[PDB]
Structures are given as structure tokens and as C-alpha cells.
Amino acid sequence: PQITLWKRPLVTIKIGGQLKEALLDTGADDTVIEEMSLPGRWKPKMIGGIGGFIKVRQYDQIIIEIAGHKAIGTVLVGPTPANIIGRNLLTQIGATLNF
Amino acid sequence: PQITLWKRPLVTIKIGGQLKEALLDTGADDTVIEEMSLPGRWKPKMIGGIGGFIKVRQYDQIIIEIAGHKAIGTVLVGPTPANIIGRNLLTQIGATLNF
Ligand SMILES: CC(C)(C)NC(=O)[C@@H]1C[C@@H]2CCCC[C@@H]2CN1C[C@@H](O)[C@H](Cc1ccccc1)NC(=O)[C@H](CC(N)=O)NC(=O)c1ccc2ccccc2n1
């Protein structure tokens, strides 16, 4: 598909057995998902945005479907205002920015 | 060009006649540049990211070249951790996401 940028590039994702809407984000190194009760072990992390840092839980090898494309990788969970799909997963679904 | 996402999508911009590096950022509504002297009228604004909100100077109708493509639009100048080109200017240069 092709997604224009007139509006936020939101797509449906499936993670942890739940459907969510998430932003396809070339500016994000990492994938950050709003607080949800994912099972298993995690590692503490702090990540940096425009306004400072937030505390997140780092989960590895998380199964995650993005606009119908399967992916697996690291997902950070914590108190974000948007679910964001960053480059660690955008590469897995073969996304490019084109102009 | 077609830009893959294994690395940060950094390009050269020209703003105020000065060359800078900036991130092509589909997750950003707005374009935010580090503190600089910039010819133009500005008004105070607040914008949010992960981590919270910051104060910026909003400059409208600024000429900016992005990877050799012309845009003229709103640039926010302030203590951003990084120079980001958001959707307001990505749309001007005809950028899309593809997968
Ligand atoms: C997600 C994370 C891994 C932490 N990465 C980042 O946050 C990196 C950090 C980099 C260094 C600091 C400068 C910004 C760049 C790019 N960002 C990605 C970048 O795409 C980031 C992702 C994002 C989207 C929505 C909400 C929050 C955060 N967007 C932003 O920082 C832009 C800034 C702007 N235009 O005003 N924010 C928004 O466009 C935006 C939209 C909705 C919101 C609702 C509530 C609160 C804040 C909201 N911010």
C-alpha cells in the first residue's frame, strides 16, 4: 500500500491478542505501545522524546501484526499518548519513505 | 528517492540560508528545528512529544529546502533534541509511506 501524509498515518495492529491503532513513524527508533498487560519477563528502559524521557518496559520477541503484515521484535510498553511503530518494525514490513 | 529505514532517515536541509541535518518524521505533525537565528516574525507556542511539552517559536511561511526539494511553511524553533521534518512539510515535498 501507499499511505499519504495529509493525516497521521494510523494503521491497525494486533499485539498481545488485541487490536489497536498505531502511528507508522519513520522518526522513531523504537516501537512504543500504550500501557497493556503483556505477559512474561521484561527489562527496565528509559526512552527519550521531544519533551524528555519516559519509563517503559522492554519486551523482546513480541509477535505483532501491522496493517496485515507479520513482524516480531522488541516492543516498549508504558505511558505514551500514541502507539508508535518505529523503524525496528517498519523495516520488517518492508516500509520505505518515497518522494 | 526511495529511502529504507535500517538507518535514521536523515537528510540535509537549508533553512535561513544555513545547512543542517534533519530527520524525515512521519510520526511528527510539525517541523521542529534546534535553536537558531532565523529571519522571520515568530510567535510563542507549545508543542508535545513523548516526555511532555516544550516551548517553541513558531515561524510561518519559511522557505526550507529538504534534500533538494522546496517547501514553504511553518517551522517551530526550540530546544528540541533533534531537527525533525514533520508532515506539514513532508506533504509539500510529496512524500509517502510505501510497503
Ligand atoms: C517514540 C520514541 C521512541 C520515544 N521516539 C520519539 O519520540 C522520537 C524522538 C526524536 C528525538 C526528539 C525529537 C523528536 C524525534 C522523533 N521522535 C519520534 C516522533 O515521530 C514523535 C512520535 C510521537 C507521536 C505521537 C505522540 C508522541 C510522540 N513525534 C513527536 O515528537 C511529535 C512532535 C510534534 N510534531 O509536535 N508529536 C506529535 O506530532 C504529537 C501528536 C499527538 C500528541 C498527543 C498528545 C501528546 C503529544 C502528542 N504529540
Does residue A25 have an active-site annotation? yes
Give the number of A-B residue pairs with CB atoms closer than 8 Å.
134
Q: Which B residues in the span 21-60 are in contact with A, Cβ-Cβ below 8 Å?
A: 23-29, 32, 47-54
Sheet-wide strand order for A2-3: A2-3, B96-98, A96-98, B2-3
Domain residue extents for chain B: 1-99
A99/B97 touch (CB, cutoff 8 Å), yes or no: no
Say which residue the cell 528502559 belongs to.
A45
- Residue B40 to residue B62: CA distance in whole angstroms: 8
**Contact assessment for residue A65 and residue A14, using Cβ atoms and an 8 Å cutoff:** yes
Which of B52, B95, B97 shows the shortest C-beta gap to A51?
B52
Q: Cα separations (Å) of B76 from A66, A82, B41, B44?
A: 31, 21, 12, 9
CATH architecture for segment(s) A1-99? Beta Barrel (2.40)
User: What resolution does the deposited structure have, in angstroms?
Assistant: 1.0
- Experimentally, the structure was elucidated by X-ray
Residue nearest to atom 14 of ligand 1 (CA): A50
- Grid coordinates belonging to B55: 516551548
